[PDB]
C-alpha cells in the first residue's frame, strides 16, 4: 500500500501536467 501510494500521487502530478496543456489547446481553437 505504501509503494502504491507513490505511483498514485505521481499519477496525479503527470495528469495535472496535461491539464495546463488542455487550457493552452482550447485557447488555440
UniProtKB/Swiss-Prot annotation:
PTM comment, free text: N-glycosylated. A secreted form is released from the membrane after cleavage by gamma-secretase.
Result of altering residue 19 to D: No effect on the biosynthesis of the secreted form
Sequence intervals crossing the membrane: 4-20
Subcellular location: Golgi apparatus membrane
Inducing factors: Induced by IFNG treatment in monocytes (in vitro).
Protein task: Catalyzes the addition of N-acetylglucosamine (GlcNAc) in beta 1-6 linkage to the alpha-linked mannose of biantennary N-linked oligosaccharides. Catalyzes an important step in the biosynthesis of branched, complex-type N-glycans, such as those found on EGFR, TGFR (TGF-beta receptor) and CDH2. Via its role in the biosynthesis of complex N-glycans, plays an important role in the activation of cellular signaling pathways, reorganization of the actin cytoskeleton, cell-cell adhesion and cell migration.
Entry similarity comment: Belongs to the glycosyltransferase 18 family.
Protein name: Alpha-1,6-mannosylglycoprotein 6-beta-N-acetylglucosaminyltransferase A
